[PDB]
């Protein structure tokens, strides 16, 4: 290569980045191709390319051209392709191109162009491609386009065209591709596209078309049509009557309201049809003649029925998406074997008959979610073999079929609260992921199976109470609480000659602790009855009356004990201050305390699942709670009262028989807080994300600490009370009498 620019042996030169400011010099007399691009030449002087009469491919891309002399391109009768993109010339050079009559490809795209002169593109009888993309012209040049009739592919995209006049492309008979996208077209004349007999692909994308064009019916041989991301409101009947060979339509991202029934019929070559959000349509489109469809999506419409001949007529269908409609009953899906995916979700289907899905040989994915399904036939899923996904969630199901579902990897059943049955893992041999309404159903399943509702030690799989020592301690708590509470009540009831307010209050709190003992006994007997089988009992226990009774008893006992402790301290203070007759007023106060405890216990009954959070039936579950307000209320209500009584006993201590049993009440307060304030703060702990604690610890510490005050009060009264021993002597005397 004489020139510094490298040159191929087959008389072809390639220069790029050499930074020349002129035409190459010293180059071969004859040359086929010449590519000078990313250079710094701006203007082409006279007969610059005359030195190469044999040139047949010429590239000046990104060279930043601004002026082409009219005679510069003269004499290149052998030119075949000419590329000029990303330059600074603002108009098509009408004179320069006229110097040649033999090239076939001419690119003038991506270079800001404002006006196309009228007799530009004249004499170019051999041109076949034209790139006018990403320029700035605002009106198609009708006469210059009509100058040459032999063009095939034309791009006018990324421009500022707003309207194309009638008969704009009337003389372009050989055109095969026309690109009009990312323009500003909003008005489309109805006599503009005529004459493009051989046009096969039309692109009208990202424009501002407000109504469906009526001109496309003038061009018959259309194959691909793209009008997407335009503001098209409705699609009229007979829109595609003039395009029988039509094979692809792109109409997504248009905000649609109404589509005519006859819009898409008689399109034999159509392969995929997608309609989203056509709200104003309410009947299935007439698809007669469209037999090659392999994907059909109709989402967001108001359709209520599916034709019974749909899947038996569209033999090639493989995907069917009909979601967010309002469909009552499904047709028979037999007669088609290529249907692989089916989506019928967010509809109003209420039942699945036996023959609905029978016959789908190739079905793999099924979606029946957010519906009103209430019963599925036992044989519904038997026929379909290679199913992998099944999604029937947020329906109203009471029972689920196990026939033909062995091979599915994923099954989803959440929100079917009426479904209390047990899923046997023998039926689902292979299953990677599972979602069930309740954790106790997933307890029976466990490369490994993942289950959405976790059994985080607060939904025990085997043992309700848990560790053997914990269960023994709870049994001992219940037994001692029941017997000593019964003994104290018997002694106080029998030694009834005169009833002081303090002795009445001690009897009443011992009465309230007996219900705590009853709750603990309920828990112990339930655990004993369901040992190693609590997966089969948690279902009914939580969603039943037993949990309500147990939770009511627990809350009532705790609140009654706290309130009676408060009044006992108030009574002690008033007595220490001193016919008085507050004794009858204190009985009234006791009645209100019991009345308030009953109200507090009954409050969660009318709420939503407050007692159903835990098998214990306590309102203090793991992490998230059914109602944060109630549990937050109860603890501060209790801690508040604790602080009061504490301050009244502080006042009594400052101030200093009547002095007797003061220590007993103080010990009662002491034990009641050391067994409540710890568990109150700890149950408060999961709300604070800073502190983390294991669910096994919570559950275990909750169970052994909740009834401990009921265990400890009567033994404290029995062993450390001269009054109790005298009452027991009175009991012995009355029994002997």
């Amino acid at each position: 290569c004489a020139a510094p620019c490298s040159c191929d042996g087959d008389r072809r030169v390639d220069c790029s980045g050499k930074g020349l400011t002129a035409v190459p010099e010293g180059l071969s007399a004859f040359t086929q191709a010449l590519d000078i691009s990313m250079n710094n030449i701006t203007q082409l002087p006279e007969d610059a390319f005359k030195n190469f009469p044999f040139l047949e491919e010429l590239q000046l891309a990104g060279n930043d051209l601004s002026f082409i002399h009219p005679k510069a391109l003269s004499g290149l009768k052998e030119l075949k392709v000419l590329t000029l993109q990303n330059n600074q010339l603002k108009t098509v050079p009408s004179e320069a191109i006229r110097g040649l009559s033999a090239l076939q490809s001419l690119r003038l795209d991506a270079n800001h162009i404002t006006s196309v002169p009228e007799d530009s593109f004249e004499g170019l009888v051999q041109l076949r491609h034209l790139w006018l993309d990403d320029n700035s012209l605002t009106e198609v040049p009708v006469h210059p386009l009509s100058n040459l009739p032999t063009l095939q592919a034309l791009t006018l995209a990324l421009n500022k065209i707003s309207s194309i006049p009638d008969f704009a492309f009337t003389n372009l008979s050989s055109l095969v591709v026309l690109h009009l996208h990312n323009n500003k077209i909003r008005s489309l004349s109805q006599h503009c596209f005529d004459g493009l007999d051989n046009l096969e692909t039309l692109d009208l994308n990202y424009n501002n078309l407000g109504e469906f064009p009526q001109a496309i019916k003038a061009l018959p041989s259309l194959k691909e049509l793209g009008f997407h991301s335009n503001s098209i409101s409705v699609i009229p009947d007979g829109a595609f009557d003039g395009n029988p060979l039509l094979r692809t339509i792109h109409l997504y991202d248009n905000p649609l309201s109404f589509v005519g029934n006859s819009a898409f019929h008689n399109l034999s070559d159509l392969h995929s049809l997608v309609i989203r959000g056509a709200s104003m349509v309410q009947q299935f489109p007439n698809l007669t003649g469209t037999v090659h469809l392999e994907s059909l999506t109709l989402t967001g419409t108001k359709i209520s029925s599916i034709p019974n001949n749909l899947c038996q007529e569209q033999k090639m269908l493989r995907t069917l998406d009909l979601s967010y409609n309002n469909i009552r009953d499904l047709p028979s899906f037999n007669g088609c074997h290529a249907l692989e995916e089916i989506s019928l979700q967010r509809n109003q289907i209420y039942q699945i008959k036996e023959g609905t899905f029978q016959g789908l040989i190739s079905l793999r994915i099924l979606d029946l979610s957010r519906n009103l399904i209430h019963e599925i036939h036992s044989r519904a899923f038997a026929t379909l073999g290679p199913i992998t996904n099944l999604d029937v969630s947020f329906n109203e199901l009471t029972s689920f079929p196990t026939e033909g579902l062995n091979g599915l990897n994923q099954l989803k059943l959440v929100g079917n609260f009426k479904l209390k049955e047990a899923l046997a893992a023998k039926d689902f041999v292979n299953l990677r992921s599972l979602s069930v309404p309740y954790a106790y159903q997933c307890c029976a399943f466990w490369i490994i199976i993942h289950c959405t509702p976790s059994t985080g030690a607060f939904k025990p799989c085997e043992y309700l109470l848990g560790s053997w020592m914990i269960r023994l301690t709870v049994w001992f708590i219940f037994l001692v609480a029941l017997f000593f509470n019964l003994l104290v009540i018997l002694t106080t009831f029998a030694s009834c000659t005169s009833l002081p307010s303090s002795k009445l209050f001690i009897g009443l709190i011992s009465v309230s602790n007996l219900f705590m003992g009853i709750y603990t006994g309920i828990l112990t007997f339930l655990d004993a009855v369901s040992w190693g089988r609590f997966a089969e009992f948690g279902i009914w226990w939580e969603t039943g009356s037993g949990c309500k009774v147990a939770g009511f008893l627990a809350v009532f006992s705790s609140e009654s004990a706290i309130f009676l402790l408060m009044l006992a301290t108030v009574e002690r203070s008033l007595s220490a201050k001193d016919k008085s007759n507050h004794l009858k007023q204190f009985r009234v106060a006791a009645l209100l305390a019991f009345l308030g405890a009953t109200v507090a216990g009954c409050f969660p009954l009318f709420h939503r699942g407050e007692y159903s959070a835990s098998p214990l039936c306590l309102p203090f579950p793991t992490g998230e709670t059914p109602s944060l307000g109630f549990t937050v209320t109860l603890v501060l209500l209790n801690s508040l009262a604790f602080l009061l009584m504490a301050v009244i006993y502080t006042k009594l201590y400052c101030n200093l028989s009547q002095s007797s049993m003061i220590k007993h009440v103080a010990w009662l307060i002491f034990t009641n807080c050391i067994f409540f304030c710890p568990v109150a703060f700890f149950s408060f702990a999961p709300l604070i994300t800073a502190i983390s604690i294991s669910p096994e610890i919570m559950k275990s510490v909750t169970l052994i600490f909740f009834p401990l005050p009921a265990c400890l009060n009567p033994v404290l009264y029995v062993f450390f009370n001269p009054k109790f021993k005298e009452d027991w002597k009175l009991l012995k005397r009355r029994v002997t009498k």
Partner: nanobody
Amino acid sequence: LRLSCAASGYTYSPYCMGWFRQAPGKAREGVATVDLDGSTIYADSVKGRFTISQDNAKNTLYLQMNSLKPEDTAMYYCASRTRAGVTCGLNWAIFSYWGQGTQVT
């Protein structure tokens, strides 16, 4: 200032005919255009200050301006068209013949 262009060929007045400006490194821009019936066309920043005279008998072209701006330093060209007077022209595309021009400082 006065500056004139002489046409070697026959008078191009019945066809598009005018003046262009060249600034180093950027595109050629037209400033004066003569058409049928002596109609004159100028660009945005040529009104009044820049003017063009045309006649057919003497076969020359005159361009006159006033009160000079160093801003206006450039090489000027006189250009003409002969065939298919499709439209009045301010861009270089529709001009076939170009002259040597002169540098104005």
